[PDB]
């Protein structure tokens, strides 16, 4: 079981907050994976991508540590990425799963041509970068499937995207950067401003502010 240290944890332990959307609407940081396991539970699958044995010299002999890459998603518009290094590969894997749950995001989806059914691809083309590799995601019709290397393919399905094209630039054979770039890409979909937007905001009540009463120890 788990005790929340802070405000936000105390509320989700109760039934005040109902979902994750509100948390994102106010851009609130989360620092407790016990929350993610509450809302998103058992619809969430994970996999490792690589185990990379870095090492360092000292006076006696090399000291090696194992680093790890993990990706997590539910196939309905969420995706996470996590990294961590330690000495035992299990403890390495365990912690990065926690960070991966933690730095989870939403991902937007839209249509290519005509708007019949549910969205299957991205609305608009976007890009990303991290240190000598650039990535570019492009919409496609309904049925092509994803065309890419295995890495982002493993990752884009976890968002729940169905169809897309793909291109790339630079040294793709460094997986760490090649992964984070496509994650930077699908992070910045809810930051592009379309004409679908441009309606004013209807500002809500900031959950900390509305449930002040229960928090002050009653």
């Amino acid at each position: 079981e788990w005790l929340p240290v802070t405000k936000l944890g105390r509320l989700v332990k109760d039934v005040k907050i109902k979902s994750l959307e509100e948390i994102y609407l106010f851009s609130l940081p989360i620092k407790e994976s016990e929350i993610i396991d509450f809302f998103l539970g058992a619809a969430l699958k994970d996999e490792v991508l690589k185990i990379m044995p870095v090492q360092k010299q000292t006076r006696a002999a090399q000291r090696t540590r194992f680093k790890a890459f993990v990706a997590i998603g539910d196939y309905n518009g969420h995706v996470g990425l996590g990294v961590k290094c330690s000495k035992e590969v299990a403890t390495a894997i365990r912690g990065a799963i926690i960070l991966a749950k933690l730095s989870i995001v939403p991902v937007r989806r839209g249509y290519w041509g005509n708007k019949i059914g549910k969205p299957h691809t991205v609305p608009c083309k976007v890009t990303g970068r991290c240190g000598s590799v650039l990535v570019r995601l492009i919409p496609a019709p309904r049925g092509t499937g994803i065309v890419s290397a295995p890495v982002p393919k493993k990752l884009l399905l976890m968002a729940g995207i169905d169809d897309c094209y793909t291109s790339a630039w630079g040294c793709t054979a460094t997986l760490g950067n090649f992964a984070k770039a496509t994650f930077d890409a699908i992070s910045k979909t809810y930051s592009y401003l379309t004409p679908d937007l441009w309606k004013e905001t209807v500002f809500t009540k900031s959950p900390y502010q509305e449930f002040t009463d229960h928090l002050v120890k009653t």
Binding site: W112, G113, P123, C124, K125, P139, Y192, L193, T194, P195, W198
Partner: protein, 129 residues
């Protein structure tokens, strides 16, 4: 030297709006810009603009409401032939929904949709979204 009057202004619109400004001033104040600005405003991407007069090139001011991402120009002014629109517009635009390539033509200055509804091609100037 300033071999092109339209290239510089859109840059000086883009940079400012990329920063967070509310107004800008762009100097040489030529005819072709006025059409270009009118059609942007008409679709709603900017506010009004007041065009200062002097016994010279003139001057001009715009009000942004910066819901614009990028404004662009294509030079040299190429020649379109009404079957290549698709090949131009897929590899300049972000999607098949929005964004307009503007072109001069015998009827005037218009966007690509209106050109196809009037069934005529022309010469290309720029693009915005």
């Amino acid at each position: 030297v300033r071999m092109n009057v339209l290239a510089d202004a859109l840059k000086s619109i883009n940079n400012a709006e990329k920063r967070g400004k509310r107004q800008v001033l762009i100097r040489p104040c030529s005819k072709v810009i006025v059409r270009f600005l009118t059609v942007m405003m008409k679709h709603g991407y900017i506010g009004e603009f007041e065009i200062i007069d002097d016994h010279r090139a003139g001057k001009i001011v715009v009000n942004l409401t910066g819901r614009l991402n990028k404004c662009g120009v294509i030079s040299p002014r190429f020649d379109v032939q009404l079957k290549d629109l698709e090949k131009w517009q897929n590899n300049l635009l972000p999607s098949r929904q929005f964004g307009f390539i503007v072109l001069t033509t015998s009827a005037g200055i218009m966007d690509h949709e209106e050109a196809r509804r009037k069934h005529t091609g022309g010469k290309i100037l720029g693009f915005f979204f």
